Design a protein around this nucleic acid. Sequence first.
RNA 1: GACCCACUCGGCACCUUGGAGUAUGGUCGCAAGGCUGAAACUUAAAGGAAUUG
Length: 78
Amino acid sequence: DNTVKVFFLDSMKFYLSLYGHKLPVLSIDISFDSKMIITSSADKNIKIWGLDFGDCHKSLFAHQDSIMNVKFLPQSHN
RNA sequence: GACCCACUCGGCACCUUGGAGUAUGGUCGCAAGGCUGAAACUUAAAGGAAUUG
């Protein structure tokens, strides 16, 4: 049920429920310095997501059948 | 008893002599406002559009 839920770790107190992919999102990554997450679904459109409130930045589109896994170069934010 | 003709009485009947418009800078509601999906996202599938590609 095409959503991404972010919980904390000291409490797990349901920090951010978010949506908008129109298919089951199947890969998540989190920025190396805890500032930006990357959600990716099977509608060929990844979304770079802001963190403080959950504002989407670029709902960008590639890989013309389906994204299967996204991962983070953990040195810079690429 | 019936039929005809005249008369007569009573019947169901018959025939002939403020609104209309228009106008509204007011009061109140309202089609008002655009390819949907679709936004903080220029983003999918599926559609309507116009399509002699």
